[PDB]
């Protein structure tokens, strides 16, 4: 399961948002992102290149913790 950071997600709209936009990913599954741990879990075997991207393109800051 791939690990991620991200950075400015201060409501619960900006993580459903951010939810869905990396299940837009070829290869996403399922996902777990919290708000209070900055933290998006991906189960799928996607790369995190193309997740990381997927956040960032909604605005807000992320990185791999891979």
Same mark, same amino acid.
């Given at each position: 399961m791939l690990k #991620?950071? @991200?950075e400015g997600m201060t409501c619960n709209h900006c993580v459903?948002? %951010?939810t869905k936009a990396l299940k837009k990913v070829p290869g996403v599954e399922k996902v777990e992102v919290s708000l209070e741990k900055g933290e998006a879990l %991906? &189960?799928?075997t996607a790369d995190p290149k193309? #997740? @990381?991207q997927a956040v960032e393109e909604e605005g807000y800051k992320? &990185? @791999?913790l891979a």
């Open positions: #991620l950071k @991200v459903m948002a %951010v %991906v &189960e799928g193309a #997740l @990381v992320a &990185e @791999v």
